[PDB]
Structures are given as C-alpha cells and as structure tokens.
Symmetry: T
Subunit: 144 residues, 12 copies
C-alpha cells in the first residue's frame, strides 16, 4: 500500500488561474500535500511543475531514486505531444493517473489523443481541481 | 447544489463480477444510495440498469419528469454506439458524468470513441468501482 | 396510389418541444392524420413513436402485414446508428422518406451519416415540421 | 414575411428532361413563378439558370441589390465543387434552401458532399420536381 | 463435449423468406432442433429470435444461467452495430459462431465490419441455411 | 459508325508549347481536322478550347444539338475539378475519351483523381500529342 | 444437374501444416476431401492442388476449366490478401468457389481482414478448423 | 528587378465590405496603384477582379503577354477549388503571392488546403488589407 | 536513333481472352504486334511474352535488357495492382514502357485504380480495347533511344 | 495601439544563414529593435531566441509579466510540434503573428500543420526576412 | 548453443546490382558473406539464394527448415512491400530473421515505407550499404538457439 | 574518411540497465559509450567518438550545433522518444549539414504504430533498428569509414 506519491503538473499550469476561478497551482499542490499529511501514516505527496519536457522527464527519473510509488500527473499540453514522458513513466515503472481539469473531449480533436491514457492506471477528466483529489485518494489506496 | 442524482448502468453491468473482484452491480448501487443518505441533507440517489438502449432513454426522460438534477452513467457498450442516449441526456438537459470501471484506453480502439464524452461534465475511467463514488461526490456538489 | 401511410418517429421525439416553439410530437401526429382524412378518398396515416430500436423494427414488420404502402420516418438518433431499422424497411419492401426537423448538416460531422438516405425515396431535412407535411403529400401521391 | 424569392438552377439543369418524364426546366420555373402569383399578395419568384459558376455568383450578387429575401437553389454539379457559390450566398446573407430532383445519397460518394448543406436553411432531395414547390412554400413563409 | 447449444437469430430474420427461397426462420429453428435430437446423446438446441438488441443481450445472460455451452448466432443487422451483444458473449464467456445466410462481403462495405468476428470461434457466411447446420455440427463437437 | 467528332481542350492548353517541344494548340487542332478530312467519307472533327468551365459545358450541350457522335476531350485542370463537365457528357449521353498529353500519374497526387475517367470509353495519358490522334482513330471507329 | 467435379486448392505454406497446432497434415485434408466425394456412390470427385507459387495456382485454375471442374474450394493462405491474379483467374474461368480459412483470420492482424476473394466467393468459411474444408465440399457437391 | 505587377481579386471580393469595416475592393485597388506610382521609378500595378474562374485564367494569360513580372492574388473561394488558376500562373511562369484578408486557418478546415500556397513565392494571410500592401512591396523588390 | 526492338508483355490470365468479350485472342494481339513492326520494313521487331507468374515476367524483363530490347509495351493485368517487383525490374534495367489495359480500369473496383506502373510509364493507355496495343506500339517504334 | 512587442525565434534559427544569404538572426533582431525606435514614441521591440520548447514557454509567461502587448513569433520546428507554445500564447492571451522565412507550403506535408495558425492573428510565410518587418509593422498598429 | 547455419536470401531484381550505383554485385555480397562464416573457424556456414519468383523464395525457406538453417538474413527487394507469403513462410518454419535494405527506403516512395517483414524480424538494417549484410551476418552468427 | 563522430542518446536512455529490460537489455548507457570511444581509439588514426545524452529536446539541439563548431563530421543518434516527435532535432541535423545514422536498440516495428513514424529516417544515411546494442557498434563502424 503506497506511501510516497508525486504530483506533476506540465506546461502552463503555473498560470492557473490568472485569466476560470481564482484557484492557483499553489492551491492544488498544497491541498494534495495536506491530503496525505491528514492520513497520518506517513503518506507524503511530493510536488513538481515545469514547462520543459526534459525537466519533467528528469523529475520522473529522480522519483524512482526517491522510492516514489505512484504519480498523479496533469501533463497539460505534453499529453498530446510527449512520447518522452510516456517512456519515462514506463521506464521507471511507476504507476500513474492522468489528470485534466477540464473535459478535453470538449475541445480541439488533437486534444482527444493522449500519449499517457493507454498506460495510465486511470484518466480523470473534467472533474475540476477535485480531479487531483480523487486521483490522490486512489493513489494512497493502491497496493505496492 | 444538486439534491437528486440518478445512477444508470448500461448493458452487461449486471454481470459484475460473476466471472474481476466479486463486487456486484448490487454493491455499487447500494454504496451510492448510502453515499447520499450519509450526506444527511435530502440528497438522494436513484438507481437504474438495463440491457436495452430504448429503456435507458426511457429512464432518462423519466428522470427529468421527476426533477433529477444530475446523472452518473456507465453506459457500458452503449457508450460506443448509442447516439440515442446522448440525445436523451442532451434533450432533457441533465448534466452527466460518464463512468468506466476499467481503463478503456487500454482496450481495443473502437472503445476509444464515446458518444457521451464530449458532452459530459467529466469522464472518469479506470478508477475502478471508486469512480462511481467520485462521480457522485461531484454531482452532489454541482450547482443547479 | 397509396392509401395506408405510416408516420414513425424515433427516440427522443416524444420530447418536442419542451426545451424550440411549443410544437409537440402529438401535434405532428394529428396534423399528419388530418392531412390524410382531409383528402376524402379513404387515405389514412397511422402514427408511431418509440425510443426502442427493436420496437420500431416490430412496427415496420406489422406495417407490412397491415398492408401499409409507404412510410414517413424521422428516426431521430437511430438515423446514424440503426442498420436494423434500415434492414426492416428493405426487408418488408416499403418505400420511405427520411425526415429531419432541423438541418443535420449544420451539426456534428457524425450526424452527416445516415443508414436510411441511400435507400430512402427522398430525404427532407431542415424544413422544420413542414418536413412531415411535404413527405406525406409526396407519400399520398406515390404509385403502389 | 418574404416576398421576393429567386429560383436558381445550375449547370446541365437546362436539359431536363431530354434523355426521366417530359418535365423541362422551363416547367419547373413557370410552376414556381405561378406559385407566388397564386399567393395573391405581391410575392414574386424570379428565375435563373446558367452553366457558368461566375455567372451564378454574379446573379446572387444582383439578387441582393434587388432585395431578394430568399433563394431556392439547385446548384447541380456545383453543389459538390463550388465554394464560390457558398461564399456568394454567405457574403450577401440571403437565406437559402438546396434542392436536388433525385436522391443524391443514392449516387456516387462524391455527391454526398455539398458545399451548400451546412449553410442551407434546409435540404430537400429525391422529392422529384415537387422538391422545388416545397422549398418555395417554405420560402414564402419565412421571417 | 458440449450438450446445450443456443441458436440466436437477430432482427428481421423472422422475415425470411417472405419476399429468397420458401425457407422460414421457423424451418431453420426446426432443422436445428432435430439435428441434436438425431445425435441421440441428450443434446439439445434451444432457439431464440428478437428484433430488440437489449432482449438478445438479456437472452445471452439467461443462456449462462441455463448451462448453455455454445451459441450459434446470426445477429443480422446487429453484427455491424452491436457492441452490446459482443460484450454479452464475452461477459458470459460462451464460445460462439457467427452465421450469415448470404455472403456479407458481396454487399455494402459497412457490412464487412463486424463486432462479432474477431471474438467468434468461426464465422460462416454465404453457405445459405446449411451455414447453420455446419455451425451446429461444430458446436456439438466442441470441448 | 461515328462521323462527327468534337475535340475539346480545357484551360491553359492554348499555351502549348510556350515553355516540352514547340507544338502549339492550333497544330493539334489542324491535325485533328485533317485526320478526319483525310478519311474521305464525310467525317468531321470540330475543335474548341476555353478556359471557362461554364463555356465548356455550353459547348458540350451545343454538340448534342449538332448531332456530334463522340467527344475527344483534354480538360486540363478541369479533369480534377469539374463535375459539371462530367455531368454534361453524361447528360447529353455523348461518348468520350479523356486525353492528357503528359503522363499525369507522374505528377502531384491530386492529379491522379479525375471526374472523367470512370465514365469515359478510354483514358490515354502521356502518349504525347499523338494521344489526340489515337483517340480520334478510336472515335472514328465507334458505333 | 448438381456438381460432379470439384477442385480443392491450398496456397503457400499450407504444406507445412501441422508441423509446429495438432498433427493434422495437408495430406490428411486432401485425402478426407477425395474420400468425401467417393463416398457418394455417384461419380463425384475431388481434385487436389497445393503450391507456394502464385502463377502456378493461377495456372491450375486455368487447367481446372479445361478439365470441366464445376467448383473450387480454395484456401489461398497468404495469397488471400495479396493475389488479385488469383481472384481474376476464378472470375476469368467463371468457376464458382468457396474461400476457406482453417483459423479465424478476424482474430489476427488487421491486414488479414481484407481478401481479394470474399466479395466474389460463394461463401467464406473461416475458423471452423479443418471441418471448414468438409463443409465447403458438402455445399459444393450440392450446387447448381 | 520587377517593374510591372498585376493585382488580381477572385470571386466575392467585389463585396468588401458592404455587410466588416468600410474598406472597399476599390480602396484596395487604388492604394496598390498609388503604391507603385510613388516609387517614381516606373513601376506599375494593374488590377483585375472577377467572379468567373475562366476570366481570371484569361487575365493571367494576357498579363504574360504584356510583360507583367509578378502577380499579387487573393483568389477567394478559388484558392481551394481552382487547379485551373494554379496551372495558369505556372503556365505563364509568373511568380506570385497568395493574399487572404482574414486568417483562413481560423475557419472551416476545407479552407486550409489551397491550390496556390505550395507554388506561391509567399502566402500572407490574416494581416488584413495590409496583406496586399506588403505583397506589393515584396513584388516591387524582386529579381 | 529510333527504337528498333520492342517487347510486348502480357500478364496473368490474359491467355484467356476471349474464351468467356469478342473472340479476340491473346494470340491475335501478339501476331498483330509482330506484323506491325515487320511492316515498318526496316528491321524493327516486336518480341512477345506472356506468363501468369510474377517471377517469370521479372525474369523476362531481365532477359530483355541482355537482348538489347529498347522499349516495353506491357499489360500486367492483375500484377498492375500488386506487383512492386515488375515495377522495379523495369526501373532496374531502365527500359522505358507503356502500360496498356484493354478495358477501362477506372470503371471497375477502386482497387484497380492504383497501379505500380502508371507513375513510371511513359504513358498509360486504357479502355481503347485491343487497339491500345497498336497505339503503344506506334509510339514505341517512334521513341528516341 | 501597442507599445511593447516581443520577437521570438525558435530552434535552429540562430543558424541563419551560416549555410541561405548572409542574413543573420542578429541582423533581423536589430532591424526589428530599430523599426520600433524609429517610430519615435517609445514603442519597443523585445527579442528572444531559444532551441528549448520549455524556455520559449517561460519567455511568453515572462512577457505577460512585462506587459508585452503582441508577439511576432517564428517557432521554427516547434510550429509543427508544440501544443505547449500555443497554450502559453492562449494562456497569457497575447495576440500573435506566426512568421516563416521560407514558404513552408513548398516543403514536406508535415510542415503544413501548424499548432499556431488557427489561433494567430495572421500567418506570413515566404516573404523571407521582410516577413518579420511586415509582422512588426502590423503589430505596432494593432489597437 | 549459437547459430551455425545461416541462410542469405535476396529477392527480385537484386541480381542486377550493380549494372547501371558502384560496381558491387550480388555475387560479391554472397561471396563476402560465405567467407565471413568461414573466418569464424567454427563450422559456421552461410548458404545463399536469390530468386525473382515469390513462390521459389517461399520454397527456399521451407527447404531451409528441413536443412536446419537456424537464422535467415533476407533482403526481399520489392517482396518486402508485397509478400505476406514470404512472411508466413518465416513464421511458418519459425526461423528467426533480419531484413536488409542496401539503400535507405525511408528516403524513397511512401509505399516503400511499409514492409511485411519488419514487425516480425529481429532487426531491420537499411541504408548501411552492402555493409548492411555484413552487420546482419555478424549478429546472426552470435544469436542464441 | 571521418575523424570526429558524435554519439547522441535521447531521453530515457540513461536508464539502460533498469529501463524495460525485457525490451532494451541490461547493458548500461555508460557501457555503450565506453565501447564507442574505444572503437575509434582502435582505428589508430586519430579518430575520436564523443558522447552525449540528454532528456531535453533543446539540449540535444544545442549539442548538435556545438558539434558543427567542433568539426564533427558524423552523428550516430538514438533520439529515443524524440525520434517520433522532434522535428527540431531533424532541423538541427539538417541546418549543420552533418550526416547521421538513426539507431533503435529494439525493433520499433514490433511496437505501437506511433513508434513506426520517425522524423529522422528519411534524412538519415541509414536506420539500424533492433540489433540491440550492436546497433551502435555497426553505426559507428559505418561512420568511421565514411567520406
């Protein structure tokens, strides 16, 4: 049963929500950190965001070294474009759930393809920032 | 916020799990009925399952006629095939979440297309039975 | 010269117009009946609606045994998914007209496919409810 | 309530029915001029036919200078090839109905694409010549 | 060795042959029943036909409840559109054979797609009604 | 047998050969006129070229009034784009042969599609200017 | 009035059955077929052919026509997906035919789903194992 | 470097902008004329507009004949349908720039394919009416 | 100078015309071609070949190079649509060629629209019936070497 | 009107033209800086180039923080592959024009897809370096 | 233990290298490979085959199995793009194989980018010139049974 | 002949040894690099192989530029994932005009269709794929012998 979970957010996700509710990246991350703290059995949620593909891959490599046992990832645009992230998650063999805040199926068809869905444990989309909470409950419940 | 959610499971879903955890349709429906009751506050989850497309359309008209304010739906095979169910939801104007117990993106490509996906609030898939639970949390916090 | 005409409407048609002018399914049916009576030569239009594919197929079967000479059909969603309805029409050998109240060509690409059009005598589409009236005028003047 | 309708037929339509019942283009046009005549209230149906794409565009342009409120068009072959005719109807903002005498869905897959349908108010096909009468009734009743 | 075989006919099949021999669904149902009697070894063929998808699914479910060990199915139209029936067969885990009386490959390219073939044990198409007999012979020898 | 043949050339072909040998449109037209005249049996080849689709359809219509019994056509770009010409040949019911001077399959993918080839008696393409001669022999021998 | 002379043709690689799933050999299938016919008291016959070379199979079909063969039962193996020349020879000699496959090709790589025989075959039996041939010979020996 | 330039506008462009600001085709044609007059070095910009494919092909041919060195062209609908125009600019060998007032990639995906882009010297599009000015500056500066 | 030696190849099943739609046999065609050259009365020649086997037609094309053949007129029949190998034989010996189809292939099943020859042939005549061959031979006999 | 404009150039662009006319990236950057000074009203053009997708994303976020009013961007390869750059421009809501020095439609089919075009204000491609000058002129005139 | 008996197969047209782009011939490549095994000095052997006829290459694969060939290195030429029959022969006899192209097919017509061998091959080397064959044989000769 | 060869390995390749060993083997990236370096040493004519690996697209592009500056005359590259996604790498290789060979350790053609497209293959001198680590050695022989 998983104690170490890493939340990753991809490009542009630092900009929520400067433009549709004031919910920021900082919020999501915090709520995730606190989610685990509150199980009080040393679960931990580590957090990372970047706009660089390679850096997200670097972070995933790091995660394995770190004994991270699950990843909740919202790869933002990189979902549609990055085989590299897919190969990283496969490569280090860490199970993961793909999060999208909005319903991608509502948008441009290029967004309906993902390089993560078919290898994710699960894909949550359009559940809002709550979608990160649901993934993290799943994660903290998953057998090593 | 919503007070009346309706859970629909489509064809074959009565068969779980006769064949991969001995978790029944019956269990899912129950857990959900409970989920709302435990919210203390006049929330309620009605349940339906049919093998027949027409009858599921019928149930969706029925749901509007009785003020159902949100649907959580696993259409099973019908996700890939039922334009009629999409139009029943659209035509009654009830928001909905598509559930899939398993991760469809892992399966045959025909199962990658859904006629519900681009009109749903969200689509949760591969989160196991838990996915009904998170659809229901969301539903019960959705404003009318 | 055709006496017995059967108007069929498909799934969700029961629902006009509760959401765009207060023109109900019931109205269309009535108008269609009166059209045939108001012809004075013992013409007649029978009416049917269902949300179930199988039921529409059955109704087309009895329509043969009942000697119906022509069918005017708004199949609603089943236009795009029902090879059964198509085969029933071919199988009983009743000529038909496909009706769409609104212009399907304005809508999502999937709705441009029909399983009726290439077998229909005509396709009227976007002419509003008057679509029915023109189909029936045409029906009534077609040679048995 | 619309009063000035223009019936447009595209290429080859001049040749019905020289090859399935003696019904000429000239009949369809006459029936349509007379249909408005009978409405009894200062409706009018103007008629046009050409085999030239630019000419049909030219016509649609002048339709708007003339205050045509609605078009009923059978673009013939141009249904499947003419973005310009689509753009003319859009550019002058005249609502329209698309008519085909026979049921194109019965014919070659190339004829299943139209550059009109998705901008048309309605599309009637396979209703035979009655298709035109039906479009006009509709036209004469619109906003 | 399999003792209980279910024969399912889909939508419109009740209509053979009203219009291409004098062979009805009732006949095909009856051949099939006798065929298993004649074997002598308490084999059994149960029959079903329905126009409704959900009802054919409902039946496949019942079929497991009943110990049916093989299904010979001519899904008619539903071969091309019914993922629900596919999942019923997979979900009850009853091995099956897809029959078509006529040769689907000779027809509209949409009829070449099936939701059954890739999971069927065999597909027989165009062998006429005998198509059913072959499928039952095979059924009655499966382990 | 056919006596009256119409040679049509589509857009731009007025410009051979100004850029892969010196042969001009009026050379080709000359040769066709004489090919038929030199039969010595009151055969006749009429010639036409235009850059306007509409006018090429007009001409194919006149050709029917004229009793023209076969058409040899090189439609230039219109091959790839004009259902209207297709439908004029079909609508007047004149049989025709499609001629491209250069081998079109050697060129851009779009030029592989034609709206004439599936309705033509034949397609000669890449046989140089002589393609027009072979088409006219063939024409002049048809029923 | 029924067919007497029948040609069983098997294509490339089929000599190799079953040397890798159970010891039923090509010669087995060929002998069973010969004996199927003789067992009819009535002068039917099965001729047998196998070849790895396309041209030779096409030559054999020409020869079959010279010999007054009224029906071919063919398993073209790999050539089913690649030989227009074989399809054109059956069409060319106007001999009817049933296409056989021992295993269910629909189960396999999508390229194997397309045939140059199916749309001109009388029937396609595929996946009925070896009995596939037997049933094709019954049908054949009963044909117009 | 190039002295004589032909600005062509295709179907429907006569209508700008009667319907989205008051810049008329005529304003554009003028500015372009004036643009080349101001260079004072003897440049010149001829202008043409038509709704008929054939006529634009004719015009392109005459421009060759009168030593036009560059063509700035907004073909409207014809970009997406006219292989005939492509073949005219190719056949008279005159370099050319494709202009679109509005950003075409924002619209219906059919308007994404163009039978000019891939042979044009440049494609300017969505830069508004200035699209024409820059095409011409570029034109007037070209070997 | 001009091409003096021309090989006519016919592919599979074409031995069968017209046993099934006028009595014009494969042999009639080959004779006619042979006669066409002889009649230029100048030491031109048409050599004729037909097989049902892809390999053998590839072989024949190789031989043709050895023999100094300078042009091929080919009706590959069904191999038109399936045979990369014939295409590469013609490319690899670098003999120029004309594709001939007796009937109009564009009138038939969509798969017959594709050819592995058309984009490398000097020309493709198709639908001009048997005269297709005569025309390809006139062209070939006038081609510059 | 806009005062602060950002010139972004993507990967490989620092290599011009080290292989097709000596015009370096520096040259283009200065021209652009200069264009704005000479407007004499404190318009300002900022410049940035990177071969790293993440970093161009960083830059666009930074531009927003700096109150950049408009972006003129040649994303080089990243045009065809980077949903991230598009979402950064969408995310910060800075209007932009896409530049390509060469005419990309002349090149491989993949270079015909852009993840910028349908969201850009305009797309200039093939005017060579003047392309940047035009995009900047336009930019500095945007309200 | 390790593969002792390797079969080198070359498909249609390859017999014509290099008659048109450097003088290296089929025979050269064959000889080179025969010697490669000889030098290992451990009773390894390369057998060689070329044919333009598909069926004959299918037959050669069967014969190989009967002979106990344990690896095939094949440049099918054009048949790569068109022969399910060849593919099914290597699958059928279960001999592991490597697909060679002398030149880089990915640089050529798009049809040449599809192979019926690649997804079943151990590796595919292309554009590595005639060395391609040598690299394939080195690998073969180290492959465990 | 060529003297300076640059071996580039793309993202994830640094995990050779651990990464998906059923598919990629258990020889580390470091061993592949050392083997390459020594391959050139042994040609005994002052050939040299230089090595580079990054998870970052931009960094690989930077490196390819750096290589023209240092007179590298040939590239042997396993772009990893970037084979299927990086037009930018392709443009860097084309912009510096350095010849290259595309290496795949596994046979990509047995894998997901996405992996059958490459943005290097059609411009590479050769593509070697599925020869496992030997792949690298053979691309390096090829380079060291190239004009």
């Amino acid at each position: 049963l998983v104690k170490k979970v890493l939340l990753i957010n991809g490009p542009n996700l630092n900009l929520l929500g400067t433009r549709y509710g004031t919910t920021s990246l900082s919020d999501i991350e915090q709520a995730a950190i606190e989610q685990a703290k509150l199980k009080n059995n040393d679960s931990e949620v580590l957090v990372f965001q970047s706009n660089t593909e390679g850096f997200i891959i670097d972070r995933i490599h790091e995660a394995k070294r770190q004994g991270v046992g699950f990843v909740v990832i919202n790869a933002g645009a990189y979902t549609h474009t990055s085989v590299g992230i897919r190969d990283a998650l496969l490569g280090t063999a860490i199970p993961f759930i793909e999060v999208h805040i909005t319903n991608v199926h509502q948008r441009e068809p290029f967004r309906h393809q993902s390089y993560l869905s078919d290898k994710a444990v699960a894909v949550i989309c359009g559940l809002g920032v709550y979608g990160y909470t649901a993934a993290i409950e799943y994660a903290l419940n998953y057998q090593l």
